[PDB]
Write a protein that binds this ligand. Structure first.
Ligand code: NDP
Ligand code: NDP
Lengths: 275, 275
């Protein structure tokens, strides 16, 4: 990828922008509205939200007050754990549309696997897909197991798997499984919620390039072929974060970053989050 | 208790109405606002919401629109999982106050224990309690061990433990432990989210008494000395639900209902939901 507009093709030929804005822990109304606006105005073409983020309304208002045609925009949201099941997901989806002021979503993800209800929730996604309400359907926080089990009974293969991904948790096993299945990986907490931006191995590599630690990580994502969705509520970081198409990491750098892995999570394990 | 006004004394001498409005899955603004003031217009003096419900603004609005004195109302909210940690709990609590339009909460709860972050989530509750911004502090979906564990380092013991409780799930053990610890049990999902309203055994007992199953269940919560907070978005259900003070269940009835128990949940198990 050479710019912000750049796209990855999903197994159904839907072009998902390689880069995005996540809006988790961002507050409803103006914070979310302004962040969405600032990102779009600076060229982001991809927003990632969730029902549980509480901010679909402010995101939906950013989109509109943004000034870019809806169809040039790729909007994602997720069904929450509590609405899992066939009928309750259908209904959960429509509430997301209505808060978002959208007629369709570009991606809709199951938030978490959990225990029992995700196969029926998938059936619900598939139907919305067929009804033409969602352009792409996918999954979030799924292990190779869940995916194996999903696939027994799926009519549509998931297009995206959005998992926590960063130097500290590099997802080697799931990456190989997912690329072999034409399921695109997407990185959540790509910045490890900020916890890596003092990392000395990363700061030496940022130094060399004249870049921030956040940029390096973000470029590392791109060179591994993982869609990314960093979050910020500060406009200069939103710009700082997209400013990565003017340098590359060498194989040398890439492996060093990879040598940071502790298989280490700052958010829930999908195998421990059971409802 | 003999009326809607009736209260239980928590171990710090705070008086919590036995009966409340639960507001889970009720929509922000008009729906919330209207639910609340229909309840208050009919004598309810306790409302239970949470940060993660995201009707806290419509609740606060309905509180003020009802016209009743702050001091006569009992408002409960909860710190969500995503925001546990000492600093984030203080912050998350100021957010609940702000959008509730309250100066203090009557009760603030740890929503779920999870895995790691509850003990110092608690330190944050305690601090706010000493700053006199919360009249009572407590906990939700804690098991005997979470509580043993909390108590090893607490300066203040939980005054309320809010857990899922209904004939399918009669929380026998946990009730003995809280009773002995001076920790007030409170029932969430009291009607099992509507699942039992059609139960055969509760039906013959309702019929005999000239009440609905929902009332029978509700009277059963009280005769067990559990605070209860049924949810309805329908003003007639709200009124019905509180109309439980003019009849009583015998020892036969109580034991019959009790015998329903299947250790059966409609919501997550606290021991499984591991964030
Ligand atoms: N599918 C799922 O279950 C999950 C999905 N996600 C998705 O992933 C997205 C991003 O992950 P997220 O958890 O938000 O965290 P990130 O890893 O992207 O990091 C965000 C934190 O780092 C800071 N930060 C961002 N940019 C910079 C910068 N360049 N320099 C210094 N600090 C910076 C931010 O502060 P500040 O805002 O002040 O700038 C913020 O506090 C979420 O918004 C969400 O959409 C996240 C968790 C789970
Ligand atoms: N701490 C925690 O994790 C949790 C806390 N809670 C709290 O407890 C409260 C209880 O709500 P919840 O537990 O979800 O639901 P309940 O067990 O109170 O029952 C809610 C369901 O019963 C329905 N209902 C159907 N018929 C009747 C009737 N005949 N009379 C009265 N109600 C009827 C309501 O429909 P309708 O509204 O359309 O009338 C709704 O679908 C919550 O609202 C929340 O405050 C809930 C869950 C977890």
């Amino acid at each position: 990828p050479t710019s912000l507009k750049d796209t990855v093709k999903l197994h159904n030929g839907v072009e998902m922008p390689w880069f995005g804005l996540g809006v988790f822990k961002v507050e409803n109304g103006n914070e979310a509205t302004e962040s969405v606006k600032a990102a779009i105005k600076n060229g982001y073409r991809s927003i990632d939200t969730a029902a549980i983020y509480k901010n679909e309304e402010g995101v939906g208002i950013g989109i509109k007050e943004s000034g870019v045609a809806r169809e040039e925009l790729f909007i994602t949201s997720k069904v929450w754990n509590e609405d899992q099941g066939y009928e309750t997901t259908l209904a959960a989806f429509e509430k997301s549309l209505e808060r978002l002021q959208l007629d369709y979503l570009d991606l809709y993800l199951i938030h978490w696997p959990g225990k029992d209800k995700y196969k029926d929730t998938w059936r619900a996604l598939e139907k919305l897909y067929k009804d033409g309400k969602i352009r792409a359907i996918g999954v979030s926080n799924f292990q190779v197991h869940h995916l194996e089990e999903l696939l027994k009974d799926a009519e549509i293969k998931p297009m995206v798997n959005q998992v926590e991904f960063h130097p500290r948790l590099t997802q080697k096993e799931l990456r190989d499984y997912c690329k072999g299945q034409g399921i695109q990986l997407e990185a959540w907490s790509p910045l490890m919620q900020g916890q890596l931006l003092d990392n000395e191995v990363l700061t030496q590599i940022a130094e060399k390039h004249n870049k921030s630690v956040a940029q390096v990580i973000l470029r590392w994502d791109l060179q591994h072929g993982v869609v990314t969705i960093p979050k910020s509520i500060k406009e200069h970081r939103i710009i700082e974060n997209a400013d990565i198409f003017d340098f590359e990491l060498s194989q040398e750098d890439m492996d060093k970053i990879d040598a940071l892995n502790k298989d280490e999570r700052v958010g829930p394990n999908p195998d421990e989050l059971l409802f």
